Amino acid sequence: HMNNYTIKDITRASGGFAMLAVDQREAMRLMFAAAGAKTPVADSVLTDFKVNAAKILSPYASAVLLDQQFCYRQAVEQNAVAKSCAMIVAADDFIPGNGIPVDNVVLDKKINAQAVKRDGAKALKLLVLWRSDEDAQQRLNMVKEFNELCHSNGLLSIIEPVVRPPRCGDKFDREQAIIDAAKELGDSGADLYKVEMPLYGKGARSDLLTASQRLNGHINMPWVILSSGVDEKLFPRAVRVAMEAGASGFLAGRAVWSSVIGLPDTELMLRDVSAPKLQRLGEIVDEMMAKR
Amino acid sequence: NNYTIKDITRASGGFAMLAVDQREAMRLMFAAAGAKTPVADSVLTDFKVNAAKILSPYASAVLLDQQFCYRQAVEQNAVAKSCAMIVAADDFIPGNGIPVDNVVLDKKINAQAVKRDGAKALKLLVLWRSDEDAQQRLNMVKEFNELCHSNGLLSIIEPVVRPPRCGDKFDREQAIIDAAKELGDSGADLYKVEMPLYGKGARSDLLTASQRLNGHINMPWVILSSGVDEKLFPRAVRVAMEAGASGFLAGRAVWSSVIGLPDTELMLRDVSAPKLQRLGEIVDEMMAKR
Amino acid sequence: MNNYTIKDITRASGGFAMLAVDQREAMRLMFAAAGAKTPVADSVLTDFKVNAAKILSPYASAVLLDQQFCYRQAVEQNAVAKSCAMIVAADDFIPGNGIPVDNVVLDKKINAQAVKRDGAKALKLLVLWRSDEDAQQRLNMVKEFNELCHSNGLLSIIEPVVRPPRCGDKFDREQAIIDAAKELGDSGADLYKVEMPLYGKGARSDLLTASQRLNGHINMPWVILSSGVDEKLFPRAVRVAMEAGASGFLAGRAVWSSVIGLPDTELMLRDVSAPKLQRLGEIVDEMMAKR
Amino acid sequence: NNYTIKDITRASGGFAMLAVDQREAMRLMFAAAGAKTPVADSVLTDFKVNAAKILSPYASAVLLDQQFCYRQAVEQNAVAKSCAMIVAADDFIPGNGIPVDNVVLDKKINAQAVKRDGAKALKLLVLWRSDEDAQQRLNMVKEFNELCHSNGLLSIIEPVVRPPRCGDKFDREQAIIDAAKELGDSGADLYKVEMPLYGKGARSDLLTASQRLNGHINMPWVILSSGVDEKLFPRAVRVAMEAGASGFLAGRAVWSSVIGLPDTELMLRDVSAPKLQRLGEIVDEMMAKR
Numbered sequence A: 001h002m003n004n005y006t007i008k009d010i011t012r013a014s015g016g017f018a019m020l021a022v023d024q025r026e027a028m029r030l031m032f033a034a035a036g037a038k039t040p041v042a043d044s045v046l047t048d049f050k051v052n053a054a055k056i057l058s059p060y061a062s063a064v065l066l067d068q069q070f071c072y073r074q075a076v077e078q079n080a081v082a083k084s085c086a087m088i089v090a091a092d093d094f095i096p097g098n099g100i101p102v103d104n105v106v107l108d109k110k111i112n113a114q115a116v117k118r119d120g121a122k123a124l125k126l127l128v129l130w131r132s133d134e135d136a137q138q139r140l141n142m143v144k145e146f147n148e149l150c151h152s153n154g155l156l157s158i159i160e161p162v163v164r165p166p167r168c169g170d171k172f173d174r175e176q177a178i179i180d181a182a183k184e185l186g187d188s189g190a191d192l193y194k195v196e197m198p199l200y201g202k203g204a205r206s207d208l209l210t211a212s213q214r215l216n217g218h219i220n221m222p223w224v225i226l227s228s229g230v231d232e233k234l235f236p237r238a239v240r241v242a243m244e245a246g247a248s249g250f251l252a253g254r255a256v257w258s259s260v261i262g263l264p265d266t267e268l269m270l271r272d273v274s275a276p277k278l279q280r281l282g283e284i285v286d287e288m289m290a291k292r
Numbered sequence B, D: 001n002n003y004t005i006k007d008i009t010r011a012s013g014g015f016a017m018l019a020v021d022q023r024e025a026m027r028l029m030f031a032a033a034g035a036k037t038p039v040a041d042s043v044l045t046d047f048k049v050n051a052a053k054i055l056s057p058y059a060s061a062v063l064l065d066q067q068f069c070y071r072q073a074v075e076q077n078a079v080a081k082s083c084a085m086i087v088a089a090d091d092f093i094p095g096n097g098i099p100v101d102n103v104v105l106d107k108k109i110n111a112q113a114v115k116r117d118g119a120k121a122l123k124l125l126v127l128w129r130s131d132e133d134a135q136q137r138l139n140m141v142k143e144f145n146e147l148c149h150s151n152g153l154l155s156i157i158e159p160v161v162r163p164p165r166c167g168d169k170f171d172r173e174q175a176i177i178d179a180a181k182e183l184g185d186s187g188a189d190l191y192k193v194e195m196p197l198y199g200k201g202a203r204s205d206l207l208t209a210s211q212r213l214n215g216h217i218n219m220p221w222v223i224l225s226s227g228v229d230e231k232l233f234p235r236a237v238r239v240a241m242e243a244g245a246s247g248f249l250a251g252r253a254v255w256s257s258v259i260g261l262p263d264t265e266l267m268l269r270d271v272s273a274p275k276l277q278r279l280g281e282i283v284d285e286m287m288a289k290r
Numbered sequence C: 001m002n003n004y005t006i007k008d009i010t011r012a013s014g015g016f017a018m019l020a021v022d023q024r025e026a027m028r029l030m031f032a033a034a035g036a037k038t039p040v041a042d043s044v045l046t047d048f049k050v051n052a053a054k055i056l057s058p059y060a061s062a063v064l065l066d067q068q069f070c071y072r073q074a075v076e077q078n079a080v081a082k083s084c085a086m087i088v089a090a091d092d093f094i095p096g097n098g099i100p101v102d103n104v105v106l107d108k109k110i111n112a113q114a115v116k117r118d119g120a121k122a123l124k125l126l127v128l129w130r131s132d133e134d135a136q137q138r139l140n141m142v143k144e145f146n147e148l149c150h151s152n153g154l155l156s157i158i159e160p161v162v163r164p165p166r167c168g169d170k171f172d173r174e175q176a177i178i179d180a181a182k183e184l185g186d187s188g189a190d191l192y193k194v195e196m197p198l199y200g201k202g203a204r205s206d207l208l209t210a211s212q213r214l215n216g217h218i219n220m221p222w223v224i225l226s227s228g229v230d231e232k233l234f235p236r237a238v239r240v241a242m243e244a245g246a247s248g249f250l251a252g253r254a255v256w257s258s259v260i261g262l263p264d265t266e267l268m269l270r271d272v273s274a275p276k277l278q279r280l281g282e283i284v285d286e287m288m289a290k291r
């Protein structure tokens, strides 16, 4: 008999999600180059930063998201993940194209779900790129195969729809695309929906709330906000507003650790600069869960 | 009919579970603490629902009985969203001057209905006696496991040792072992067991007794608090878990001391809750060593 | 002279969440009563006090230590968490009439400069109060104590404790607590450590009325002590006292009395006593936030 | 008219103090962040009072100016009861196209009146230049010390180095040392100093520079944040305190990043407060090593 993990296994005791992403791959290599690291940036620079981020920040997170390419095995072998923090393993295969590192994404066929479970993983995660002029059924079929990979192995399924401009045309409304992706994928049988924040978290709180309530109405599973595209200083308000609209927390990377890339004394910087940001987000999640 | 043990655990995988399903035994506790007799049913219901309301935020699951508090706790939204519900499925039969002389499966429990309303598990007390037929106990546990699993519920069994119907050859410590030899591989999802030696004495003796017990239980196991001083129960959880236990399913060591005090809800928050919180912390600390 | 201030012995909130382990022959009697081997050796008291300081001081804004059994040991062994201020007892307990503390004088063995050099921020003095003993003798002792503290840049904590009269059987404990506060509640000390009205028993409304009555007679910050209050009633006593104007607690028995005589002292202080002290600290912050 | 340094410290003995007394320098920061010019006085007052209200619970003391916020903060009870008040006593004189070209004692300060409101300290910026008279700076500091001490207030001095009036021989690092040689034993209670090397570069070189500075200050000393990236200020506090500093009296590294954002109060709580909280934690961690 299979004892599946449950969403409670990746939440704070409150039931809110306060989750850390360090699974960025070639996108993280480009961030090191942009911050002034010697090029070419060696794989070990990414591995060392990811494992240090997990070691120093995972005590503040209900779950951490790791990639097999650069850090899952290293984090497990080095006991970097706090025992209070669940492990999520990326199961997406990023395909570069058109001058960006993630132009297409397919399910990573190399992942051994039983083996990552034996190492302590509770969940897998799949980025789904959404475009108005690409076939919805191909996206749904990938999410169905992913759900089956997770559920047949007693793991949770986390999907992350991310909107992109159409392959052809200049008819792109990012705010409508986020809604349309949720109309398509918001009831797709995953355990958790990781979504972009409306309006990049910018502008009047009341307008962010209206936009977040509109999104909530199309998601029939628990949902959390991601930080890509949101200034680190606006992300705490984004979490408060999204949770007022019905979200259950956050799964964030850049808004926690991007600002320390290129500084001296990386471990001190992760403790003094990144950790207080992640701690505050956790406190906001508990405050919002207490109001239900 | 899918079910998972993870529906009643902390995120650590440890069990930090609260029992408030005590029936006539709880009425006798109120009388002993000086309550006006006869103690009305509403006094037990109000205490049970207050205990669930104030303490369930600190518990991975709470155990409720239909006689006095399941329906009331559900209807009054007393159970924290973070805490799973376990419903008792035991029918306590009094005899020989005690409230629980025999136990059968409670035919009044509607497993489909408690599943519909959000329950994750049922619980069955099994009285163990050396001179009563083992196969009758096993047949009751088999029927119970099927009632649970066919309805998508977990099965929690609670073997409790009693002296033989005839004879005076009664070693409580050997009986706990003998009950686990009999029932420890019975197909239930969780074994709720009495703590060896009432949690008293040297840690070395408690660890040896807990390791011995571990060897006979082929499912996750948790300790109950009956007979353990509330001040010794945290050490009992530490020792039992060092031996292989996965936590506790406890009532008395959490809330017995506030029966009879003024301001019951303040007392549950200030006296009982810190005890339950510490046990939860111990469970996570011990799970972190695996 | 840069004197300490009451904020130096409070939580960041300004509430007092302070631990007393300075009990002397009274603690030896507790060990005997709990079934320890008699006669109880001094090392049993020293070891328990240092273990209590080591395990519980992380949860306290200040800890109160006596030189007789544990101050030097706690300092030498770095038992006091860096987050927890040290208070040194400056009372000399005189036994009599079959009890360990029948009279109290200022302890002339205390070297205030030496305990300050060790990091002490405050001294503490028990004052026994009896209706048929001279008020001026008590006030003169409190004045000498305030001068010992303040001339050395230390805080002064006074602890009036009511006793039945030397002669007679007219003893109203609740009126005595009020009368002691009328006498000593404006005596120039920095903090008043007082017994809880009504032993913290009975209806909340009556406890609050009694605590408000007491508050009106104390013209310095005040905290409640736990002697006489059941450990299970002490959290409510702190809440009600603070609602009446108290600023917290300086408590021993309601934190650690229950573990005396148990096996595994260090585990019991961590698992039984620490959660009680943690909860009291949480209640102090909750009540300070309502100001 | 007693005073004690312990009126402005954490219980650890460290200083975790918030500056919101910036005057025309703050107006220039609002313009730089995209506010239309001229920026109204009310923009500065509202930001300062909000900063005191939301951040003073995390500070041992808060520094306020009479120009824009002292009276408003007092009238509105913006300063947490746990946070001491410091009042600026500097009169900034513009010149040469900058807001602070010269500084004299602010003759408008009524030391007894601000003490009656609860103030524990005054603060004076002293501009230091190698080719201006040292005795005039010492005389101003002595008059200030007497204003403070005679009225039961602490004296905080803030020497800030500037290039000489005439010449181009300016070594900022040597000037910081020379200012401390001049003023580091001037009878003030607290020295507020610029961080060597802007807090940049290798930790070992920052420590050596901070130790050199420490040797010339014969009173407790704290670092200010002007010139230090907000992300490097926590390391600067750690290194300065390793060298002998006792904490910080900082503004920009706490609240500069929220200037121009929507929802100022939420931003001060969610962005600025965690930075000030972390600095306070570092102060207690470094004091614990003494």
Ligand SMILES: *[C@@H](COP(=O)(O)O)[C@@H](O)[C@H](O)[C@H](O)CS(=O)(=O)O
Binding pocket: B019, B021, B022, B023, B024, B025, B026, B063, B100, B125, B158, B224, B225, B226, B227, B249, B250, B251, B252, B253
């Ligand atoms: C399990 C644990 O409770 P404790 O109070 O022993 O920790 C309960 O479910 C038991 O079945 C009851 O204690 C049985 S009874 O009502 O006492 O008879």
Ligand SMILES: *[C@@H](COP(=O)(O)O)[C@@H](O)[C@H](O)[C@H](O)CS(=O)(=O)O
Binding pocket: D019, D021, D022, D023, D024, D025, D026, D063, D100, D125, D158, D224, D225, D226, D227, D249, D250, D251, D252, D253
């Ligand atoms: C001291 C510390 O503030 P920081 O922002 O430098 O950390 C303040 O009191 C300074 O005097 C002001 O920064 C002066 S000014 O208004 O900028 O001219």
Ligand SMILES: */C(=C/OP(=O)(O)O)CO
Binding pocket: A021, A023, A024, A065, A226, A227, A228, A229, A251, A252, A253, A254, A255
């Ligand atoms: C998911 C979120 O990371 P970020 O918040 O976008 O940087 C990464 O898989």
Ligand SMILES: */C(=C/OP(=O)(O)O)CO
Binding pocket: C020, C022, C023, C064, C225, C226, C227, C228, C250, C251, C252, C253, C254
């Ligand atoms: C003051 C308080 O101790 P207790 O709470 O009365 O035991 C002892 O100096």
